[PDB]
Ligand binder design. Structure first.
Ligand SMILES: NC(=O)[C@H](CCC(=O)O)NC(=O)[C@H](CCC(=O)O)NC(=O)[C@@H](CC(=O)NO)Cc1cc(-c2ccc(-c3cccc(Cl)c3)cc2)no1
Ligand SMILES: [Ca+2]
Ligand SMILES: [Ca+2]
Ligand SMILES: [Ca+2]
Ligand SMILES: [Zn+2]
Ligand SMILES: [Zn+2]
Length: 159
């Protein structure tokens, strides 16, 4: 029962890009991650390059300006703030990980689906098949599906 955006049009902006991947692949991973959630809700997401976005996607290292400092390679991979103005909604990814499009390193798409879930108001799930489960696991991203638990959670917040 976390906070929700009180609107169905939500903007995002990619503040900066990890050097681990090329720019087009970061854009693609993030766009696809948003699409996962838009597919089961009334929410629409538009990327903007200037202006005031609701959800700011950031790659940062260690102590990076909030009360959720990162811990170097491994451990916590990313974190996100629930809906709200300013820092609210923003999704932060630990640059000390090695972000990838694949099964090696840490898959950006999967991690982004999880974080965007928080950006929309979801908390963690106890279901090990849920993308909102607390621990990262790689799954073939081409056959990725939200679990029924994730769909339940997000539909309880929107629509
Ligand atoms: N322990 C680990 O396996 C890794 C470390 C690996 C390494 O060394 O690099 N670290 C984590 O998993 C950490 C643990 C942090 C802790 O609790 O101490 N967890 C994260 O980094 C989470 C932190 C968080 O909650 N941020 O909001 C981030 C996270 C969660 C996932 C996510 C993605 C897909 C799935 C999944 C699971 C089952 C099925 C499907 Cl389809 C998908 C469910 C979770 N992606 O990013
Ligand atoms: Ca924000
Ligand atoms: Ca880390
Ligand atoms: Ca990196
Ligand atoms: Zn942060
Ligand atoms: Zn989480």
């Amino acid at each position: 029962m976390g906070p929700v955006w009180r609107k169905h049009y939500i903007t995002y902006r990619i503040n900066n890009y990890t050097p681990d991947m090329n720019r087009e692949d970061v854009d693609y991973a993030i766009r696809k991650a948003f699409q996962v959630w838009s597919n089961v809700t009334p929410l629409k997401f538009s990327k903007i390059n200037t202006g005031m976005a609701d959800i700011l996607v950031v790659f940062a290292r260690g102590a990076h300006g909030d009360d959720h400092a990162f811990d170097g390679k491994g451990g916590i991979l990313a974190h996100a703030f629930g809906p709200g103005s300013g820092i609210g909604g923003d999704a932060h990814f630990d640059e000390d990980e090695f972000w990838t499009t694949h099964s090696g390193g840490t898959n950006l798409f999967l991690t982004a689906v999880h974080e965007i879930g928080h950006s929309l108001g979801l908390g963690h799930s106890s279901d090990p098949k849920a993308v909102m489960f607390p621990t990262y696991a790689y799954v073939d991203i081409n056959t990725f599906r939200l679990s029924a638990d994730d769909i339940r959670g997000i539909q309880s917040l929107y629509g």
